[PDB]
Structure formats: structure tokens, C-alpha cells
Amino acid sequence: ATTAKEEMARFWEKNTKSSRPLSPHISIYKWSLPMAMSITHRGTGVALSLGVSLFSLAALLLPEQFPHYVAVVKSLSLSPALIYSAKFALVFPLSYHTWNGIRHLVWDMGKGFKLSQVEQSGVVVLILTLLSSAAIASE
């Protein structure tokens, strides 16, 4: 016999030096809503982090303080519709990540695992994200 650890090492030694191709995956797999929402959770999380890091870095490197830059934008008298749209786009990823984050914590407690529940909780998260973002962007 061979231990499981020796079998794994032989598998990698044999296949990495062989002529066998790796069968396609991400390019041929059918997407579903839960699958798309999962990579979006990661994408929003990373965007939010980069955002916080840039802010933090701007705080340390910009010449002026925060109020000065807010005043300069206000001085331009930009279209309120454009401002509304900008607020929507800023809060959308945070709203999405927060609501789907809550959906993740409920799975960690062991709940909502039936396929029908996974699909329903996912659509509820998209609805809450859109309602939240719309309400917050208007205030």
C-alpha cells in the first residue's frame, strides 16, 4: 500500500511533467445567481478595502484637510441629479456587501441551506440593496 500523502505527491509529480491538458473550467461552467453573488461579495469587499486604504493615504499625503475639499466641490454647483447618481454608486457596493455579509453570517449559524432558501435569500439581498441605496442616496 501507499499512504494518502505519498499518493498525492505521486499524482502531482506525474501530472505536472506529463503532456495532459487541464480541462476547461471558468470558461465553460454555467453561472447561477448564487455563484455571481458570491464573486460579487468578494469584489465589493476588495473595492471597499482599497477605498479605505486610499482615503487613509490621502489623509496622510494631501496638503489640505477634509473640509477644504468638500467646499471646493460645493463651489462648483454640480447638477443635483449627477450628485445623486454619484452617491448611489458610492453606497451601492457597501450596501451590497453589508446585506450579503449578513446572509453569510446566517449560513455560518447553519441556516438557510436548502437550494430554494439560497435562491430566495439571494434575491432578497438584491432587493434590499437597491432599496437601501435608493433611500440613502436621496438623503
Binding site: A4, K5, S18, R20, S23, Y29, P34, G110
Partner: protein, 239 residues
């Protein structure tokens, strides 16, 4: 009269290594073929191209041999109905992100070694009385194994998991983790604490991010994702 359906299938021959993987199209008359995709594969190999290669044995969805990717999803060819819409071509590929031995046949040796590593067998603190009398198990404790022991080790779920695609060398995958759980909750097994201790590293269990492709694709209707969540709760609370 006839009803011609087209199938586009992945081909690669290790005896002509340099010829890159390609897709080949076959035309099949559905009026002269059984209703499942495996029936069409066998009809093609018997009548149109006997070099077309794939694994199969039981034809009733119990052995797990014929797992492959059909119309974008992992499933068993023998229980997957052919789509009778003649205007659509059905695409067939091997299980995803696996080394191809030939055509639709993947190398599952790492998947089997991972399974062996979790010791899938009954362990008692004192085994010297083995074989003398039946061990008792109540109807209620036996019911805890339903949804877990039925796994046919087809690998459809692990090969549909992106975490397994990126880290299959160290992440055990949904199939193997659900069997680890099946042994953890069996009331006759005495090694629950050691089974959990084995998963205390960053990869074995913790690469799972609850994507849930595994439960969606399982041909037996089981829920490996839920089983992984139950193990994570035990890992967090055991002493």
C-alpha cells in the same frame, strides 16, 4: 422520418499528444436513441466513432462513473435527459479543472487520496470485541446519517467548486468533507475530537467560502455545503 440532434464533444488523444484539444460534432437521430445523454454517447461510439472514450458502468445513476460537464453543469450522463430542442447543440466536456487522461476521462487519483486521508471507517476506543455482537444504534441516531451516507463519490460537487479549482492540492473539497462529517456524527464512532483536529490548518476545510455550486450540482440531491457548515460549527465549539 427523423429528429437530428447535434452534440459537440471535447476530444484529446494522449497517443497524438501534440494535437491540441478540440471539439467534434456528431449528429444523432433521437427517434432511434434512448432518452439519456449516456445513451447518445454509447450510440455515437457504437455507430459513428468508436474512438470516442468515456467511463460508464451502471447506467442508473448509482456507481458514479459517468460524471462529466453537460450544457455547462456537472452531472451523471446516465440520468441527464437529452434536450430535444433540435435547434440547440449540446456541449460535453470532462469534469472541470482536472488533468485529462483521454477525451472525457479525468484523473481522479488526488480526489481518491484525499478521501483516504480522512480515515473513512469506524474507529472505537476498544476494537477487541469486534465481530461478537451488533452495536446498538437508535432510530433517532441512525436518522442523523440520512443525506450523508448516500454519496456515490462521483466528484461532481468538488469539481464544480472554484475553491477546489484554485487549491485542490490542499483543500479537501465538498465530497470528502461531507464524508468526514458522516463519520463525526455516527454515534458508534469514538474519534470525533481527533477527526476535527485533523482540519486545524488553513486549507483542509477553511478554503470553503459557501459558494454553494456543490449542492446545486449534486445528482443525488445531497447538500455537502450544509455539511461543511455543520463541521465549522463543531470546530468552533469542541474542547
Amino acid at each position: 422520418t427523423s429528429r437530428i440532434k447535434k452534440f459537440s464533444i471535447y476530444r484529446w488523444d494522449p497517443d497524438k499528444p501534440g494535437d491540441k484539444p478540440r471539439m467534434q460534432t456528431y449528429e444523432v437521430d433521437l427517434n432511434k436513441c434512448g432518452p439519456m445523454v449516456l445513451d447518445a454517447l454509447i450510440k455515437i461510439k457504437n455507430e459513428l466513432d468508436s474512438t470516442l472514450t468515456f467511463r460508464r458502468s451502471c447506467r442508473e445513476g448509482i456507481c458514479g462513473s459517468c460524471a462529466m460537464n453537460i450544457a455547462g453543469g456537472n452531472t451523471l450522463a446516465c440520468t441527464k435527459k437529452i434536450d430535444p430542442d433540435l435547434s440547440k447543440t449540446t456541449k460535453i466536456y470532462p469534469l472541470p479543472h482536472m488533468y485529462v487522461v483521454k477525451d472525457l476521462v479525468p484523473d481522479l487519483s488526488n480526489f481518491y487520496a484525499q478521501y483516504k486521508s480522512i480515515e473513512p471507517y469506524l474507529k472505537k476506543k476498544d476494537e477487541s470485541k469486534q465481530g461478537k455482537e451488533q452495536y446498538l444504534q437508535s432510530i433517532e441516531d441512525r436518522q442523523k446519517l440520512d443525506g450523508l451516507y448516500e454519496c456515490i463519490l462521483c466528484a461532481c460537487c468538488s469539481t464544480s467548486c472554484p475553491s477546489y479549482w484554485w487549491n485542490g492540492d490542499k483543500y479537501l473539497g465538498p465530497a470528502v468533507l461531507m464524508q468526514a462529517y458522516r463519520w463525526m456524527i455516527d454515534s458508534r464512532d469514538d474519534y470525533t475530537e481527533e477527526r476535527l483536529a485533523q482540519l486545524q490548518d488553513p486549507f483542509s476545510l477553511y478554503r470553503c467560502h459557501t459558494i454553494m455550486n456543490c449542492t446545486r450540482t449534486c445528482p443525488k440531491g445531497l447538500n455537502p455545503g450544509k455539511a461543511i457548515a455543520e463541521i465549522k460549527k463543531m470546530m468552533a465549539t469542541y474542547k
